[PDB]
């Protein structure tokens, strides 16, 4: 029982746009998250690729098994291959195809310590469901979420402190005279997806030999409702601001006790340690999902009870978040 709310805001007037909502769920046992997939009953069928199997690397920490050294409260790390379904691992052009196919994208992000997990369920639907506003029920493990459609008193804008807001910055904005954003990492090989070639340019980070590093972009939805924005793109300074916020605060925006640091092997078959993490104890916090930077092929990382190194000063033993939520400042004006 005790159903939880998934708020989604819809404008009166519609302008290739999708809306997104999120909800943070209470902690659940880690063992029960295996084979956990969202089961939706909406009129829009969930995308079949989300429920597919994505192979993750499970990195866990435990006190040292060896007696004598265990008396010195030392801990070791174990890397293993696991199969995770329903996680927010989007593919190239999946959002647009879902938009044109009237299909929803329902996935969840996991925030886990060594034993318990806090899931954050996400749903991306086209605005085509904002007129019918048919209520839906989604089941994810022992939790229930209410799909609630809210009609804001804005034609095309987003409500901020009781006022509407439309970000243009275009010539239209000139004539007329903090926004929440959620991002997902999509891995795709190519030549125009040199993510870290732009990271080295944007921030003073000693990252040489970027060719062998991870390739991909970040797709973000600003203000709940907006057209898909790729990150980074050099001709959208809004996307550039999203990029900066992603790499200035990789852990996100807004207890737990930090245990010693550790290193681990992200493929679980590597010759040497390839990732730096911070193990911790306490209530689950931050994101347990990340992607190894030093590998062209996306090496997804699941580290319950550990904090991946997101500082990126040295590109060795580095990682980037799978999902990112925060606030970025963009120019614009309110209606009226």
């Amino acid at each position, epitope marked *: 029982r005790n159903v939880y709310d998934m708020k989604i805001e819809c404008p009166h007037t519609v302008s290739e746009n999708s809306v997104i909502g999120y909800v943070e769920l209470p902690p659940m046992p880690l063992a029960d998250t295996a084979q956990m997939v969202p089961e939706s009953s909406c009129s829009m069928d969930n995308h079949q690729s989300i429920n597919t199997i994505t192979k993750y690397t499970q990195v866990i920490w435990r006190g040292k*098994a*060896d007696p004598g050294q265990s008396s010195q409260n030392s801990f070791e790390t174990v890397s293993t291959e696991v199969d995770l379904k329903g996680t927010c691992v989007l593919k190239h052009k999946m959002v647009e195809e879902s938009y044109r196919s009237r299909k929803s994208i329902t996935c969840y992000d996991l925030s886990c310590n060594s034993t318990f997990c806090k899931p954050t369920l996400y749903m991306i639907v086209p605005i085509h469901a904002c007129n019918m506003m048919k209520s839906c029920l989604i089941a994810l493990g022992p939790y229930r979420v209410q799909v609630v459609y809210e009609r804001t008193y804005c034609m095309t804008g987003v409500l901020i402190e009781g006022k509407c807001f439309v970000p243009d910055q275009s010539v239209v904005s000139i004539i007329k005279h903090s926004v929440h954003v959620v991002c997902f990492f999509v891995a795709v090989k190519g030549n125009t997806y040199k993510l870290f070639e732009q990271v080295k340019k944007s921030f003073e980070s000693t990252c040489n030999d970027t060719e062998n590093k991870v390739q991909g972009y970040y797709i973000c939805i600003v203000g709940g409702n907006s057209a898909p924005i790729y990150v980074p793109t050099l001709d959208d300074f809004r996307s550039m601001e999203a990029f900066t916020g992603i790499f200035k605060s990789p852990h996100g925006e807004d207890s737990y*006790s930090i245990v010693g640091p550790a290193n681990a092997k992200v493929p679980h078959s590597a010759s040497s340690d390839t990732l730096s993490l911070i193990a911790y104890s306490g209530i689950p916090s931050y994101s347990s999902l990340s992607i190894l930077t030093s590998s062209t092929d996306a090496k997804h990382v699941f580290s319950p009870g550990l904090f991946p190194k997101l500082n990126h000063t040295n590109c060795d033993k580095s990682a980037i978040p799978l999902t990112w939520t925060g606030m970025i400042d963009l120019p614009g004006y309110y209606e009226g």
Partner: antibody
Amino acid sequence: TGQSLVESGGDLVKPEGSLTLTCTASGFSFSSTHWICWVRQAPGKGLEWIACIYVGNTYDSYYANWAKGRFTISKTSSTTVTLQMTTLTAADTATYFCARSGSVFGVVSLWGPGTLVTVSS
Amino acid sequence: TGQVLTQTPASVSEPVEGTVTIKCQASQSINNWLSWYQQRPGQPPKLLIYDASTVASGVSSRFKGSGSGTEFTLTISDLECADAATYACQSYGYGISITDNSAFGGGTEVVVRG
């Protein structure tokens, strides 16, 4: 240089009765990266898991499927843990060991001599 | 699911300076997560092999653990009189597999012929 765990209690208890065991640590700080567990072994049967507790600042415990609801494990101080047993039957007569591990049900880095609980009328 | 651990043989009789082979098979596959314990009567059990291949500090090199997946073996070379004890294998899981595959071996009796 002796680090060890010592189990107390374990007397003769009538059937359907209750008995509380206690495990104490000697010459070893408790830290926050350890797990304390209880293991029992009946005469003529293999080792059996009972329950575990994260024994840190935060509270987390795991019980066996057979011992769920009937047993109770909890940490008392920075050197002692307990194990409440209720409605004990003849099948509960075994030797109860105190275990220290780096994970929930993982490698036991150190054991104890064990205590015997005799359930007889 | 219910994970069951099978340990064979129940009893083994090998002379001094010989070798002892103990087979421990898991119903569910475990990625090299096994532990070997030595338990003398009236004594706390001692950990000798953890991670199915690593020798614990202070344990003689004559104890060798091998195996992966669903079948593991323990070999005792240069058998001594002090090695006569009871041995058991523990199958432990980590992360998602906590309590999923967590069981103890049946136990094997080792008698040293002198």
